[PDB]
Amino acid sequence: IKVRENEPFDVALRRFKRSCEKAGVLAEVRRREFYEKPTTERKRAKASAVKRHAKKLARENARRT
Amino acid sequence: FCRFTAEGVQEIDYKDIATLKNYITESGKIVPSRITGTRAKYQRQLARAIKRARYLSLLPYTDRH
Amino acid sequence: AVVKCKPTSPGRRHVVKVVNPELHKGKPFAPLLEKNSKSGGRNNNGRITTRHIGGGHKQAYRIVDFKRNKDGIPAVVERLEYDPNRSANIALVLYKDGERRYILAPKGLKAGDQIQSGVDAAIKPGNTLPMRNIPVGSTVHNVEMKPGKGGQLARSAGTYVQIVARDGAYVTLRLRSGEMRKVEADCRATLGEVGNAEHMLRVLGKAGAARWRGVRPTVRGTAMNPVDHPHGGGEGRNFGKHPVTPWGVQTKGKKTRSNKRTDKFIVRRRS
Amino acid sequence: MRHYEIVFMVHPDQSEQVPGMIERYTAAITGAEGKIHRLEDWGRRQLAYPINKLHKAHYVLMNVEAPQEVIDELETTFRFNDAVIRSMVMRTKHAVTEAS
Amino acid sequence: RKQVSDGVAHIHASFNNTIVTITDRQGNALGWATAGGSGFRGSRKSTPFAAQVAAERCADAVKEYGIKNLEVMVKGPGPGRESTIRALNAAGFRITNITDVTPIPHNGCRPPKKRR
Amino acid sequence: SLSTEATAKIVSEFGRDANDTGSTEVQVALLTAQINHLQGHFAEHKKDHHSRRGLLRMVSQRRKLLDYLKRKDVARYTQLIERLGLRR
RNA sequence: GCUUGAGUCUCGUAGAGGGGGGUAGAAUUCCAGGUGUAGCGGUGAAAUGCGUAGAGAUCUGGAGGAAUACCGGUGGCGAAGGCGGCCCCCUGGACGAAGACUGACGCUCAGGUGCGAAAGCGUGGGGAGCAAACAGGAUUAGAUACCCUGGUAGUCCACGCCGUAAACGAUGUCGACUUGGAGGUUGUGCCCUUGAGGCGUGGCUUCCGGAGCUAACGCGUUAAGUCGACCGCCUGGGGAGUA
RNA sequence: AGGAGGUAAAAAUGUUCA
């Protein structure tokens, strides 16, 4: 949101902007209100997240590689 | 990973800006619990601490002031 | 109390009576009264200048202190009255030195409260004090235009003006209609709003209900002949004319404002 | 009676006239038998963000214990006194005395 | 003319265009250039290359003032936003500090439902 | 909502002593004390619907007890309704 | 009579539980003024629309209304509907701890009564944004739709009404019994807090799964498992949840 | 390994029984 690298930089190098928000919340408060999908798609979000966590502890098969 | 008042119990104060600014990014956002490794109970008091101190102009709402 | 009557007869089935049980059920203070005759809408020349006025119930004039020139003399609200010359109710206050006066009754002001005027007034409803002592954003009523003039704006039932900004010697108020006037800072204003805000919920019901308020039958210009009203004429309710007053001036959208000496104070016109 | 942790900031220029004020507010409180715990006057420090304009205001903490009636007496003297800007009252939790 | 030494460049990068203007530190504008006036009508109007020439044609018209160092305040998400500053870096100016002044609300007024 | 001293007053009054805190007489008077105090709350507000449901609960809890007391001991029941001021 | 049912009292704990009153910051729109100039906005493309009267952009100041970014998590609370910026006042419920007390006061409940998203209706205010209807421009064989620019009711507040939702874990309520694993959350006791802790004990809650159960899917100690008490409800499709 | 920005204007219909 604010960078200087005071004197010797000569290059953008601003990864700091994307680390805060800058676009994740703009392409969210851009449109599509709902008041419904939030609880729907985010209950959908971590539903699949726990199963990737499940097979994280479930890839102990052989498969030969 | 790290811990706080979870072991050495203490009440999170809002006048204490020293320990409070560790939980605030350069933008002026409240960091999530999924990073600082704090407990849920102490987190809520900490969230209330930020909102109280922000009202008393001790912490910025954003860095564009 | 917005109470609706019961249809025991036609013309009583629509009447909505606004009753206030706190209103003194006796006689007003004799010294502060004076007669008030009916004009009938007839001026010096005896001609009816303002139409639809006459009859009504005979009523007396209760001299109300709008000015409020007393300073630092705490008074107590004795009783709430009914005033047939207003829209709001009047409170008969009693000062410390034994003086009795009639004032407009604000919203939150029950008989037995304590008010006072002057620059040493605490910010409490009923208290009158110059506008550079009243906080900006506050709600006032019975506000003046000229210092010590008296108070003209916001005087009817449930009315109030809002102090929206203050710069130097001129304080801008937002009137009840939406106008944004400017005013001298020495103008005294009374805190709170004007009480009896349920006045507008009252429906008259009977045609005679209006007849004793003093109003008189209003005749539509279409019903008349062309010699009486620009509209008139016709052989079966014909109109075909641009709506005007009985004096040929275009009504329904035609600004008649032309003062020019007072527009210096007026910032924003209503909308 | 309940404890309170009121915090009120005063205008910079009016900070030269503030000391007498603290003793004025406490007088009405102890007049009603309200016990005082702290009186920590922080001092004129920087306002993180502009408040109605003009930053760098003067902070005053009181930390009072008093009856419920005298506080609305006290907070009404905050709304209508434009010298003091942005006041705030809080909860008890057995008022303390040490931190700064 | 006035010969202003320093200046602040502003970049309003939206999803269908980018209007980059150059003002001084006091806010009074001294010239601008859009991707919509550099030709590019339609699909090319929302491209980083169009943001490049916009920064170039804004590098001109401010020559009368000739500002050395330049503060950069980019605003809004979109196709430009980054190609407008790299083109402005090679424009010859001295980029002092780059900042992001995107107008993020705290759940204020309600955004449209459009798009299907 | 019944401060501790008010609770302590009624409990040692309608029963044997401070030890007596669970008897039926004690309960009815103590509940009535809360309802009489809560009557002031719903005098105004009129729309605090959630807390009201808490009131109606203790109302019927009182009525369950009184119907028990009458069914078990009409003697003390008659003396309780006259000392508390209810039961038409 | 008695106590393991039920309920009460003393001490503490967590929470978007509820009602009322103030307050704050970002942002949107609008208004006034300075700088400055041909586009702006929109889209698959485009056009209507806004614009040399001088927009958009930028800076300063002002007025309003509504919603509360981050914290925020298959996290918490509530009977359900549902409720989250901050603070104050009034106030409900739930849980835990070591005890005392009353002594079956209980479970359920046709009819009855109350609460009950949204939309809608009435009276009176308010009205930024969003947006039915409507209009215009496109798309199209047509487009009274999808998309775009505008836009009224409505959405907000107070007081009444309506009583309906896929009001749904599509699973009625209370109570007892029947292998475990891993997390979340909130109380509590003991041990060396010897160091982000170790071992038991309660309530709520999520995922995976054993027996059993099921038409199968799946449920699986918060059961659709094994039983008990009461209530509501179903009897082929359509007609019709209509006359 | 863990998280953010970007990624399809238009295309209707198919007689009856077996």
Swiss-Prot record, chain B:
One of its GO terms (cellular component) is cytoplasm. Gene3D superfamilies: Ribosomal protein S18 (4.10.640.10). Part of the 30S ribosomal subunit. Forms a tight heterodimer with protein bS6. The gene is rpsR. GO terms for biological process: cytoplasmic translation; translation. The keyword rRNA-binding applies. The keyword Signal does not apply. This is Small ribosomal subunit protein bS18. Belongs to the bacterial ribosomal protein bS18 family. PROSITE patterns: RIBOSOMAL_S18. Pfam families: Ribosomal_S18. One of its GO terms (molecular function) is structural constituent of ribosome. Binds as a heterodimer with protein bS6 to the central domain of the 16S rRNA, where it helps stabilize the platform of the 30S subunit. Keywords: Acetylation, Ribonucleoprotein, Ribosomal protein, RNA-binding, rRNA-binding. It comes from the Bacteria.
Swiss-Prot record, chain D:
Disulfide bonds: none annotated. GO terms for biological process: cytoplasmic translation. Keywords: Acetylation, Ribonucleoprotein, Ribosomal protein, RNA-binding, rRNA-binding. It comes from the Bacteria. 5 different forms of the protein, varying only in the number of C-terminal glutamate residues, were isolated. The sequence shown is form bS6-6, which is the longest. The first two Glu are encoded by the rpsF gene, the other Glu are added post-translationally by the RimK enzyme. Signal peptide: none annotated. Coiled coil: none annotated. The keyword Acetylation applies. GO terms for molecular function: mRNA 5'-UTR binding; small ribosomal subunit rRNA binding; structural constituent of ribosome. The modification N6-acetyllysine is found at K93. One of its GO terms (cellular component) is cytosolic small ribosomal subunit. Part of the 30S ribosomal subunit. Interacts weakly with uL2 in one of the 3.5 A resolved structures. Binds together with bS18 to 16S ribosomal RNA. Belongs to the bacterial ribosomal protein bS6 family. This is Small ribosomal subunit protein bS6.
Swiss-Prot record, chain E:
It holds the Pfam family Ribosomal_S11. One of its GO terms (cellular component) is cytosolic small ribosomal subunit. GO terms for molecular function: small ribosomal subunit rRNA binding; structural constituent of ribosome. Belongs to the universal ribosomal protein uS11 family. Has been predicted to contact the N-terminal domain of IF-3 based on footprint studies; exactly how IF-3 interacts with the 30S subunit is controversial. The keyword Transport does not apply. The gene is rpsK. The lineage of its organism: Bacteria, Pseudomonadati, Pseudomonadota, Gammaproteobacteria, Enterobacterales. This is Small ribosomal subunit protein uS11. Part of the 30S ribosomal subunit. Interacts with proteins uS7 and bS18. Cross-links to IF-3. In stalled ribosomes contacts ribosome rescue factor SmrB. Keywords: Methylation, Ribonucleoprotein, Ribosomal protein, RNA-binding, rRNA-binding. SUPFAM superfamilies: Translational machinery components. One of its GO terms (biological process) is translation. Located on the platform of the 30S subunit, it bridges several disparate RNA helices of the 16S rRNA. Forms part of the Shine-Dalgarno cleft in the 70S ribosome.
UniProtKB/Swiss-Prot annotation, chain F:
GO terms for biological process: cytoplasmic translation; regulation of translation; ribosomal small subunit assembly; translation. InterPro entries: Ribosomal_uS15, Ribosomal_uS15_bac-type, uS15_NS1_RNA-bd_sf. One of its GO terms (cellular component) is cytosolic small ribosomal subunit. Keywords: Ribonucleoprotein, Ribosomal protein, RNA-binding, rRNA-binding, Translation regulation. The keyword Ribosomal protein applies. GO terms for molecular function: rRNA binding; small ribosomal subunit rRNA binding; structural constituent of ribosome. It holds the Pfam family Ribosomal_S15. Induction: Part of the metY operon that extends to pnp, also has its own promoter. PANTHER family: RIBOSOMAL PROTEIN S15, BACTERIAL AND ORGANELLAR, SMALL RIBOSOMAL SUBUNIT PROTEIN US15M. Belongs to the universal ribosomal protein uS15 family. HAMAP family: Ribosomal_uS15_B (MF_01343_B). One of the primary rRNA binding proteins, it binds directly to 16S rRNA where it helps nucleate assembly of the platform of the 30S subunit by binding and bridging several RNA helices of the 16S rRNA. Binds to its own mRNA, stabilizing it 5-UTR and preventing its translation. In the E.coli 70S ribosome it has been modeled to contact the 23S rRNA of the 50S subunit forming part of bridge B4. In the two 3.5 A resolved ribosome structures there are minor differences between side-chain conformations. Part of the 30S ribosomal subunit. Forms a bridge to the 50S subunit in the 70S ribosome, contacting the 23S rRNA. The gene is rpsO.
